[PDB]
Amino acid sequence: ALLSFERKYRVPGGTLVGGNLFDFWVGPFYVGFFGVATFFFAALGIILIAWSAVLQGTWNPQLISVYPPALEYGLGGAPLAKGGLWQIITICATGAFVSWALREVEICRKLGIGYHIPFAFAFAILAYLTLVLFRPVMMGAWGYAFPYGIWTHLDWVSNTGYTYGNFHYNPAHMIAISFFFTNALALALHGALVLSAANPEKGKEMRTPDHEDTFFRDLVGYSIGTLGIHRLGLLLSLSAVFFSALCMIITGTIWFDQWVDWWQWWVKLPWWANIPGGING
Amino acid sequence: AEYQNIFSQVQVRGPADLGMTEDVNLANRSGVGPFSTLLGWFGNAQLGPIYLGSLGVLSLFSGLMWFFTIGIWFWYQAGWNPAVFLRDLFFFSLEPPAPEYGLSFAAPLKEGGLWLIASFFMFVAVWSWWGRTYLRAQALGMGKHTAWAFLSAIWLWMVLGFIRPILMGSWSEAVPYGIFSHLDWTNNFSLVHGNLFYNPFHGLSIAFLYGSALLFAMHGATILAVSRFGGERELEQIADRGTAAERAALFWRWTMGFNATMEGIHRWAIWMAVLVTLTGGIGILLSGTVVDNWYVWGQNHG
Amino acid sequence: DLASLAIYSFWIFLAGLIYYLQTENMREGYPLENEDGTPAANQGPFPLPKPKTFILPHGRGTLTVPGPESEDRPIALARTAVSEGFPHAPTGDPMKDGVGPASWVARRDLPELDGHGHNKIKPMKAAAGFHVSAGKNPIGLPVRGCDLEIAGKVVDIWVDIPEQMARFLEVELKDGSTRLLPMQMVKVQSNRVHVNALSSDLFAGIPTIKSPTEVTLLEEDKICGYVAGGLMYAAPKRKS
Ligand code: BCL
Ligand code: BCL
Ligand code: BCL
Ligand code: BCL
Ligand SMILES: CC[C@H]1c2cc3[nH]c4c(c3C)C(=O)[C@H](C(=O)OC)c4c3nc(cc4[nH]c(cc(n2)[C@@H]1C)c(C(C)=O)c4C)[C@@H](C)[C@@H]3CCC(=O)OC/C=C(\C)CCC[C@H](C)CCC[C@H](C)CCCC(C)C
Ligand SMILES: CC[C@H]1c2cc3[nH]c4c(c3C)C(=O)[C@H](C(=O)OC)c4c3nc(cc4[nH]c(cc(n2)[C@@H]1C)c(C(C)=O)c4C)[C@@H](C)[C@@H]3CCC(=O)OC/C=C(\C)CCC[C@H](C)CCC[C@H](C)CCCC(C)C
Ligand SMILES: COC(C)(C)C/C=C/C(C)=C/C=C/C(C)=C/C=C/C(C)=C/C=C\C=C(C)\C=C\C=C(/C)CC/C=C(\C)CCC=C(C)C
Ligand SMILES: COC1=C(OC)C(=O)C(C/C=C(/C)CCC=C(C)C)=C(C)C1=O
Ligand SMILES: CCCCCCCCCCCC[N+](C)(C)[O-]
Ligand SMILES: CCCCCCCCCCCC[N+](C)(C)[O-]
Ligand SMILES: CCCCCCCCCCCC[N+](C)(C)[O-]
Ligand SMILES: CCCCCCCCCCCC[N+](C)(C)[O-]
Ligand SMILES: CCCCCCCCCCCC[N+](C)(C)[O-]
Ligand SMILES: CCCCCCCCCCCC[N+](C)(C)[O-]
Ligand SMILES: CCCCCCCCCCCC[N+](C)(C)[O-]
Ligand SMILES: [Fe+3]
Numbered sequence: 001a002l003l004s005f006e007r008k009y010r011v012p013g014g015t016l017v018g019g020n021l022f023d024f025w026v027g028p029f030y031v032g033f034f035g036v037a038t039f040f041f042a043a044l045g046i047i048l049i050a051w052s053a054v055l056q057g058t059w060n061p062q063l064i065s066v067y068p069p070a071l072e073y074g075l076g077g078a079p080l081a082k083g084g085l086w087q088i089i090t091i092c093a094t095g096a097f098v099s100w101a102l103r104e105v106e107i108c109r110k111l112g113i114g115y116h117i118p119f120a121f122a123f124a125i126l127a128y129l130t131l132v133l134f135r136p137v138m139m140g141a142w143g144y145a146f147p148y149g150i151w152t153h154l155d156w157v158s159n160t161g162y163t164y165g166n167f168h169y170n171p172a173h174m175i176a177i178s179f180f181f182t183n184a185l186a187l188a189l190h191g192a193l194v195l196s197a198a199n200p201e202k203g204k205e206m207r208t209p210d211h212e213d214t215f216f217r218d219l220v221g222y223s224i225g226t227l228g229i230h231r232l233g234l235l236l237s238l239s240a241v242f243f244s245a246l247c248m249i250i251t252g253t254i255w256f257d258q259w260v261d262w263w264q265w266w267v268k269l270p271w272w273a274n275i276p277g278g279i280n281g
Numbered sequence: 282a283e284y285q286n287i288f289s290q291v292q293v294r295g296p297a298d299l300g301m302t303e304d305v306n307l308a309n310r311s312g313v314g315p316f317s318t319l320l321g322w323f324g325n326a327q328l329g330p331i332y333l334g335s336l337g338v339l340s341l342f343s344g345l346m347w348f349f350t351i352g353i354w355f356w357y358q359a360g361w362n363p364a365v366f367l368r369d370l371f372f373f374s375l376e377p378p379a380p381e382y383g384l385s386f387a388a389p390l391k392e393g394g395l396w397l398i399a400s401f402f403m404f405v406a407v408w409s410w411w412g413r414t415y416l417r418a419q420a421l422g423m424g425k426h427t428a429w430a431f432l433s434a435i436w437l438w439m440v441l442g443f444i445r446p447i448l449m450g451s452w453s454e455a456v457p458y459g460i461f462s463h464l465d466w467t468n469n470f471s472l473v474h475g476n477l478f479y480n481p482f483h484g485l486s487i488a489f490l491y492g493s494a495l496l497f498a499m500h501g502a503t504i505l506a507v508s509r510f511g512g513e514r515e516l517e518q519i520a521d522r523g524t525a526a527e528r529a530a531l532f533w534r535w536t537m538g539f540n541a542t543m544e545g546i547h548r549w550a551i552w553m554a555v556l557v558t559l560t561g562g563i564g565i566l567l568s569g570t571v572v573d574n575w576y577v578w579g580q581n582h583g
Numbered sequence: 584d585l586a587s588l589a590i591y592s593f594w595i596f597l598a599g600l601i602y603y604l605q606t607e608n609m610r611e612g613y614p615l616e617n618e619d620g621t622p623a624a625n626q627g628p629f630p631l632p633k634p635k636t637f638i639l640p641h642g643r644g645t646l647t648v649p650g651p652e653s654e655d656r657p658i659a660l661a662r663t664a665v666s667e668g669f670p671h672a673p674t675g676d677p678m679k680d681g682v683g684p685a686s687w688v689a690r691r692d693l694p695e696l697d698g699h700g701h702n703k704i705k706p707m708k709a710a711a712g713f714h715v716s717a718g719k720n721p722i723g724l725p726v727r728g729c730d731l732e733i734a735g736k737v738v739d740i741w742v743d744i745p746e747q748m749a750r751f752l753e754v755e756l757k758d759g760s761t762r763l764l765p766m767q768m769v770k771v772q773s774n775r776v777h778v779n780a781l782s783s784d785l786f787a788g789i790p791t792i793k794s795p796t797e798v799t800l801l802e803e804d805k806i807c808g809y810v811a812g813g814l815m816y817a818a819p820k821r822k823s
Contacts, residue, residue, distance in 0.1 A: 001615060001616075001618075001623050001668075002617065003615065003616070004614070004615075004654075005654065005688070006616075007616075007618060007620075008654070008686045009683065010671055011660065011670055011671060011684075012670035012672060013670075013683070013815050014815065020670075023670055024669050024670065025669075026668060110683075110815075112684025112685070112808075112811035112814050112815060198637065203638075205638045206639060208698040209698075209746060210698030210699075211698055213746070225748070226746065227746075227748065
């Protein structure tokens, strides 16, 4: 039940709520007040989904889907079989995610480490909240939120995107995408570079970080360094998500026409709007 | 407020770092570039040296030729007018030959010939660049992980511009060179194949793309959270585990009930990343060669 | 059909890859132990991988993992409950004893070396000719702890040569000796360096280094563990 080096770290302390009341583990898992909160929220949420499944009349995971209130309910309550369950499951999800982040903070404090991890996770939570809470509220109805189902949530992405034409033309979406692709690129290279150093050609000694800098300067004329790469992966992945949330929060609110038409502002600039030739003359 | 190690508070500099020698032909290395204090807030201040070499030159010349061929066509589409060039920059497009030319090299310059020439240059640029990622590791005695990883990106690329067109019987299936047009091509590809959301390899590619950001956010944040114990010195933590690697593993064991090592996180990393383009390339390559309509295929599972 | 074949194959491949990855990541810390240090009955469904060996540079030897695990140091903690899963109370001063968030690992009592075989980390005074290139130069500033008292003054910065970065501040105490403070644990301000982790009376307790111009992987761990431990353990002497 313990890693060989684990015991010296399992001291008391670090909790945010409850003093020593929940300061303990179950197998590998730390508990804490927020472990209890997470269990409660997640448990209710899952039970409510299983109840929503009965009211839908299916048990197949590819078919279970919990849809938010239809648009006519606005921002109000809805009968359970018709949107109410979604609404309660969403409060449960939120409670679970935030509890999970706060439990991570208790773990950081016990371990004497920086808070970077729950801080990073809070970006994902902010993205979920943009879709299920912030955007629907600004738009005036819960029904603009995505439904909880494996394929139905995809139907929502497709339908929502094509409401605005080819969603590729959302410029915040272009930036988000660029961060996603760049992040995967940098993840590949970081993993590969560390491993190429740690696992050199047969019979050779482990290479050093000096070799890692060298390899990347040889290759592209720069190396960000070992601190920098971890700063970078973190920045790229949080930026991707910041821009994801941004790209959606602005859609259906400040911009609601076809995203491709947004780009006319540049073509219509007085200096060149009226010169013939090219694509737009 | 405590210091968070996102940006450095104090930079230091010493003699330009010329790098490890090992088996590298030193005649082929530039001098050092300048030193960017701006960069140094976040990463290393030093630029260069870079390695040149014969393959290097070839790859760069080829890459330029690809870039210039597209840009020449763009200027032409702009009727040589600077103002129209900038106005319409994202709208220009160098397009592959029409279906009727099939796989032949016999289309006119203005109607696909130029596309093939640009593509030719892109092909030698990328592959000789691949050669360089292998060769620069070799000369340093390092593993070949970078070149193996790069090969997975190359695979989606080769599938899109080369292998899928060949299997379909025409260059018209390939992607055009343009900012907006490559996007239109992408949206169209999905429409014409019954919605890529029903392609299991597209959904896998997404799981991995999102998984990469999840994992890089996790790893990057973890290393920074343990940088106060020297956590980013990962190679020496692998050789001689410290309290950084242990606090890191235990953060995760305690949170989610399992954990990595300092070396093995890097393997979860490389694989999470390469599988984006591995599964992606497969999903595209199957699209239209074997499966005409993902929604249809999905209804039969087979 | 071929797509069906590819997808079924992929999932088999992926199960194999996850198995490979989880077992690679069992090269340290396993087998699992009970709280008393004996092998736990339940090791889980993944077995240990075959050993691999890393050849270390500069005559430092090799590392083979998995291998026998031991702490190689005394752990001054005791149970607080009669069953598994509860915290272990420090039996003395956890800062002095190096447990909890004050923990250190029995790393090699040698300095990390760069690719040329020289000490990776050196005081800047001995690093030719490294200098501050941007930001407030901390050298000469008073050092303040979380009790808002002055603990000493910065007399140098220890720098990583091959990576050109600041790693520690060397701080001189009232008695004329120095300590290392991790760069990540200090805040360089215009008139001072502020250290939230430690009150000023804890500075003398920071683990000392044996030679004044180098620091070993073991000494770094003890210094860094001790300073981080102050977050939890100096909290009574801190201080809104
Ligand atoms: C995966 C399915 C589609 C596709 C779908 C999309 C979608 C959707 C989006 C992009 C976006 C991008 N795509 Mg695309 N993309 C495809 C294949 C590619 C290929 C290729 C196969 O060689 C290339 C070069 C590009 C490149 C581009 C960039 C213009 C842009 C950001 C990429 C990035 O962050 O990379 C990683 C970062 C790097 C380190 C290198 C990238 C640097 C860029 C600037 C160079 C690429 C082209 C370059 C000539 C453009 C210069 C602009 C001016 C003409 C000077 N795409 C295929 C066909 N791509 C985003 C965009 O902003 O589009 C406008 C976007 O929203
Ligand atoms: C036809 C469809 C449209 C489309 C319309 C849309 C729409 C609509 C949306 C996007 C959004 C996204 N699109 Mg798009 N877009 C399309 C084309 C693409 C293409 C492409 C190559 O063509 C790409 C690369 C992208 C990429 C992007 C991303 C920038 C973004 C999704 C990531 C994200 O929001 O993360 C954010 C991460 C999360 C929300 C996850 C958070 C989860 C956390 C908090 C908790 C989960 C815990 C729990 C339940 C797990 C279970 C516990 C178990 C024990 C494991 N789109 C086409 C043009 N796109 C979305 C976006 O930005 O959303 C904000 C969005 O809503
Ligand atoms: C982010 C922008 C869009 C959206 C765009 C898309 C698109 C497009 C696709 C997915 C796909 C996925 N999405 Mg989605 N997705 C959205 C928000 C979510 C949220 C959420 C915010 O709570 C969740 C939990 C999911 C989860 C899912 C998975 C079923 C599937 C693979 C994801 C993945 O590997 O992520 C990366 C994270 C990891 C690798 C960690 C693993 C965690 C996963 C496996 C958790 C699964 C949870 C699920 C089975 C049930 C959760 C509830 C339980 C009762 C606890 N999506 C919003 C609406 N998503 C893909 C799919 O194939 O769907 C069929 C796909 O093509
Ligand atoms: C309307 C749009 C369609 C759709 C159509 C497509 C199509 C078509 C494709 C994808 C593909 C992808 N889609 Mg999709 N996509 C849909 C909706 C989404 C959504 C969403 C709704 O949220 C998401 C998250 C995604 C996400 C994804 C990615 C998982 C995947 C591309 C991975 C990649 O890294 O490629 C980026 C990486 C590369 C392109 C490889 C780069 C090649 C190397 C060699 C670079 C050479 C560059 C060099 C020469 C240039 C130098 C310039 C520098 C400045 C030096 N899609 C909808 C349903 N999608 C791709 C895929 O694999 O599908 C299975 C793909 O072909
Ligand atoms: C911000 C950058 C990226 C990121 C970062 C991030 N994610 C994080 C963290 C970080 C740093 C972790 O600390 C935390 C973690 O512990 O990881 C292992 C986590 C995490 N990210 C996770 C998932 C996840 N992250 C995602 C994405 C991202 N996370 C971003 C791309 C996605 C995507 C892309 O779709 C998913 C699916 C989990 C593995 C984990 C948090 C687990 C957790 O909160 O557990 C507590 C709650 C439960 C155990 C279950 C709650 C059940 C609900 C009450 C009911 C379900 C409702 C749900 C809304 C229905 C969904 C149905 C779907 C079909 C849509
Ligand atoms: C595993 C999946 C991910 C991935 C991985 C990946 N990419 C790779 C590799 C790997 C591991 C690298 O080894 C290789 C690399 O060298 O990275 C630094 C690379 C790479 N991926 C790149 C781009 C890229 N990768 C893509 C992304 C991805 N790559 C996936 C998400 C994308 C997307 C998302 O579309 C882009 C656009 C390059 C940065 C690099 C491959 C470089 C290359 O093939 O070069 C060929 C052409 C040239 C040599 C130059 C081209 C000409 C330029 C247009 C001119 C402008 C600059 C010029 C060089 C200036 C010259 C001036 C002088 C005269 C002074
Ligand atoms: C200022 O003006 C100048 C002219 C000086 C410079 C400006 C230039 C400009 C504006 C350039 C702009 C370039 C742009 C916008 C390019 C964008 C390209 C994009 C977005 C590419 C996206 C997809 C590319 C793919 C998938 C291509 C794949 C290519 C291959 C796999 C190569 C296949 C090889 C073929 C078909 C040739 C076969 C030949 C043999 C025999 C091997
Ligand atoms: C293997 O790890 C990596 C580094 O290598 C040691 C890097 O160097 C970079 C390059 C990062 C940046 C900031 C490019 C911009 C720099 C200039 C010249 C302005 C990436 C992506 C990376 O993955
Ligand atoms: C030409 C695209 C180059 C790829 C880099 C990122 C793409 C985003 C381009 C859109 C710029 C957004 N904005 C608002 C500044 O116009
Ligand atoms: C190398 C890291 C920089 C990201 C490069 C990827 C292209 C995305 C465009 C960057 C635009 C960001 N911003 C905030 C300036 O608009
Ligand atoms: C891609 C790297 C470029 C990013 C440069 C950002 C510079 C930020 C400088 C902040 C300095 C903070 N402070 C207070 C210590 O000076
Ligand atoms: C993707 C990063 C590209 C960075 C390119 C850096 C080029 C370094 C220039 C070195 C030239 C030095 N010099 C003039 C002495 O030869
Ligand atoms: C590095 C390995 C991590 C494995 C993560 C795999 C997540 C699986 C998500 C299911 C995707 C479903 N589908 C049908 C689109 O393939
Ligand atoms: C893809 C999501 C699947 C959910 C399973 C999560 C994996 C956690 C494995 C740790 C199990 C903990 N333990 C030691 C009690 O077995
Ligand atoms: C995305 C990959 C999903 C797989 C992650 C689940 C693997 C759990 C491994 C748990 C094993 C922990 N244990 C018992 C060896 O200590
Ligand atoms: Fe790393």
